[PDB]
Design a protein around this ligand. Structure first.
Ligand SMILES: Nc1nc2c(ncn2[C@@H]2O[C@H](COP(=O)(O)OP(=O)(O)O)[C@@H](O)[C@H]2O)c(=O)[nH]1
Ligand SMILES: C#Cc1cnc2sc(COc3ccc(F)c(C(N)=O)c3F)nc2c1
Ligand SMILES: [Ca+2]
Length: 306
C-alpha cells in the first residue's frame, strides 16, 4: 500500500496555495486546480485543471457569491469525481469568504469523502479589513466545510498580522500561511514513504484524522540543550491556527532524531504534548532514527478531537 495523495485548490486563494506548492516542488502528490474563472485557471501549472460552472458564469469567477460557487461545482460534479479517482487522501485548500471557494469547496470535499478518501480541509478566514459580509460568508463556508470533511484546519488571515513587522511583504506573509498546508502534506508523504523504528503508517493517520472535527498539524525543529522540549513546544504552537492543542483527544506524534535520540528526551517531548491534550487522548507515538542527522531533533504532531 502506497497511499495516493491529492491536493485540490478551489477558487483564487486555494489555487494560489497550489501554485506556490507546485513552484516549491512536491514529489508523489497530485495537484488539482478548480475554479470558475477560466483566465486564472489557464495560468495554473497544475496537471489537472477543472473549470467549473461554465454554463453558469460564462468562464468568469463567482463574483464573491457562494451560491454561484456551489451551483458551479454541482454543474461540474462528474468532472470533479473523475479528477479525484484513485485518491486515498485529499487536501481541499480554499479561501473562505469569496464565491468559488466558499460555495464549491464543500461540494468538492463531500465528493472526495464519499469516494472514501481521507478528506482534510485547509482553509483561510478573511482579514477583518475585508469587512463583515466577507466574514459572515466565510463562517457559513467553514460550517459547510466542517460537515463535508473528515478534519478541518482553519487559518484566520488576521493571524498573519501577528507575525509581520510593518514592512514584511504581503507575499511573504502569504507564504507563511501556505506553509501550513505544505508542511502537512509533506509530512504525510514522508510518513508513508519512510519506515520508522516505531513505525506509523497511513492507517494511523486515518485513525487520528477520519471523522474527527477540527485539527492541528505542526512541526518543530531544535538542537542543543533542551532540544526535545523546544521542538515539541514549537510543534504544538499555533500562531496561525484557529484550533489550539488544548483538549485534543487524538494525537499522532513522531520524533525524528539522529543516533543520539535518547529515551529520556522522547519522554520529555511526549509529556509536553500530553500535558496539553485531553486526559483520555488516543496518542499514537512514532520514532525515526535518521543517522544523517547530528544534533537536530524534529517533533511533529497531528492533533484532533476537541
Ligand atoms: N492567505 C491568503 N488568503 C487569500 C489569498 N487569496 C485570497 N485569500 C482570502 O480568500 C478569500 C476568498 O478569495 P478568493 O479565494 O480569491 O475567492 P473565490 O475565488 O471567489 O473563492 C479572500 O477574501 C481572502 O481572505 C492568498 O493568496 N492567501
Ligand atoms: C505540520 C506537520 C506535520 C504533522 N505530522 C507529521 S508526521 C511527519 C512525518 O512522520 C514520520 C516520518 C517518517 C517515519 F518513518 C515516521 C514513522 N514513525 O514511521 C513518521 F511518523 N511529518 C509531519 C508534519
Ligand atoms: Ca512510516
Amino acid at each position: 500500500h502506497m497511499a495516493t495523495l491529492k491536493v485540490i485548490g478551489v477558487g483564487g486563494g486555494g489555487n494560489n496555495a497550489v501554485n506556490r506548492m507546485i513552484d516549491h516542488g512536491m514529489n508523489n502528490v497530485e495537484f488539482i486546480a478548480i475554479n470558475t474563472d477560466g483566465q486564472a485557471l489557464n495560468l495554473s501549472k497544475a496537471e489537472s485543471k477543472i473549470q467549473i460552472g461554465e454554463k453558469l458564469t460564462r468562464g468568469l469567477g463567482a463574483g464573491a457569491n457562494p451560491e454561484i460557487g456551489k451551483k458551479a461545482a454541482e454543474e461540474s460534479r462528474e468532472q470533479i469525481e473523475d479528477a479525484i479517482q484513485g485518491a486515498d487522501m485529499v487536501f481541499v485548500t480554499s479561501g473562505m469568504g469569496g464565491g468559488t471557494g466558499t460555495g464549491a469547496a464543500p461540494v468538492v470535499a463531500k465528493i472526495a469523502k464519499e469516494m472514501g478518501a481521507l478528506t482534510v480541509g485547509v482553509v483561510t478566514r478573511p482579514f477583518s479589513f475585508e469587512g463583515r459580509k466577507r466574514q459572515t460568508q466565510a463562517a457559513a463556508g467553514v460550517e459547510a466545510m466542517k460537515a463535508a470533511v473528515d478534519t478541518l484546519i482553519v487559518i484566520p488571515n488576521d493571524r498573519l498580522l501577528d507575525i509581520v513587522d510593518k514592512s514584511t511583504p504581503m507575499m511573504e506573509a502569504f507564504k507563511e500561511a501556505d506553509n501550513v498546508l505544505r508542511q502537512g502534506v509533506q509530512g504525510i508523504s514522508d510518513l508513508i514513504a519512510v519506515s520508522g523504528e516505531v513505525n506509523l503508517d497511513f492507517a494511523d493517520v486515518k485513525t487520528i484524522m477520519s471523522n474527527q472535527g477540527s485539527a492541528l498539524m505542526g512541526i518543530g525543529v531544535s538542537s542543543g540543550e533542551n532540544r526535545a522540549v523546544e521542538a515539541a513546544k514549537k510543534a504544538i504552537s499555533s500562531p496561525l491556527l484557529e484550533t489550539s492543542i488544548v483538549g485534543a483527544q487524538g494525537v499522532l506524534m513522531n520524533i525524528t532524531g539522529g543516533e543520539s535520540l535518547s529515551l529520556f528526551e522522547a519522554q520529555e517531548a511526549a509529556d509536553i504534548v500530553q500535558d496539553a491534550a485531553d486526559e483520555d487522548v488516543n496518542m499514537i507515538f512514532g520514532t525515526v532514527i535518521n543517522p544523517e542527522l547530528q544534533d537536530e531533533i524534529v517533533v511533529t504532531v497531528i492533533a484532533t478531537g476537541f
